[PDB]
Amino acid sequence: TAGYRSLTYEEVLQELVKHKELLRRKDTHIRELEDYIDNLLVRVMEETPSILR
């Protein structure tokens, strides 16, 4: 009864937290790729004397 309610509560909490953590990991991965592209743009800056003359 009280136990059924507590299991229900914990189950909703667990499911929401599961999906939040999935999204958090995806967010981390996208930020990593954005940083990689930013670094390539910095490299292109550094390499501009070779690309343009």
Residue boundaries of the structural domains of the chain: 22-53
Phi-psi region of 52 (alpha: psi -120 to 50; beta: other; left: phi over 0): beta
Cβ contacts of 44 within 8 Å, gap of 6 or more: 51
Query: 36: which 2 tokens?
Result: 């990689």
Residue type, 1: T
Torsion angle defined by CA atoms of residues 12, 14, 15 and 21, in that order, rounded to the nearest 10 degrees: 140
Contact 51, 44 (CB under 8 A): yes
Query: 23: which 2 tokens?
Result: 């999204």
Cβ contacts of 51 within 8 Å, gap of 6 or more: 44
